Symmetry: C2
Subunit: 140 residues, 2 copies
Amino acid sequence: EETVTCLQMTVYHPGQLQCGIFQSISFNREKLPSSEVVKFGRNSNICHYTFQDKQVSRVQFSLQLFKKFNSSVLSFEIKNMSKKTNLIVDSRELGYLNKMDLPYRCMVRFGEYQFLMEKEDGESLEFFETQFILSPRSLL
Amino acid sequence: EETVTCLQMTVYHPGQLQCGIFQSISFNREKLPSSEVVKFGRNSNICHYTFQDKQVSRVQFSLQLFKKFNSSVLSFEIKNMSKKTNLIVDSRELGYLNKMDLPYRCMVRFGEYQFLMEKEDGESLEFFETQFILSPRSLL
């Protein structure tokens, strides 16, 4: 068998334990085909990860997978799918329909949401795993 | 209203008029949301453009839309979705899960298939149009 790439995401929100923003979110490991486009946002019908929050567009941002030139493995690219809010990856600011490569480790945020992004590689080009972990406290 | 971006594709295959590779293809103008990922290949269930051909993978290649940095408009990026066959964009060769920006005019091919790609711009970031034209003869 091969090792599949897993994206570990560790997430914080201040209203995490009072509001119900995270009540739909799965904390299982999720194994997905590399053709999949992972969607984050408000719309429960198409978003793999739904946030029950009015401060969130129906689709906030998305992850797609692709093979870089001169690479034997899968890379994540992140794309801002929201008009209103600017997605911030590390120090960089993504506007509507802007996209970027995803650092092996990075800080993704929009709103009061904090996404610690951590990539462990795999040999597999067919599938990828994604994993949601609730942070007890802020990652600042 | 705004002008929407349209991708004109002019297509040729030698077995075009003898085989039934193109019998499912729409020649209408098709208006699609910029969140859409346009799929080309053999699988009729997910491919916006289906080719009835065994020399074609279930998904051959895909088009996605995004806003470049320092741009007010939509750009197409093309991605090879087939393991077997190498997609050729102009002079360049795309391997499995390789992607690239799509030239305003270019020649896309895999197999005996020829895709003349022609982009006319628009102001709209919400939608894009795509348009399939059968070529009477080869574009060499």
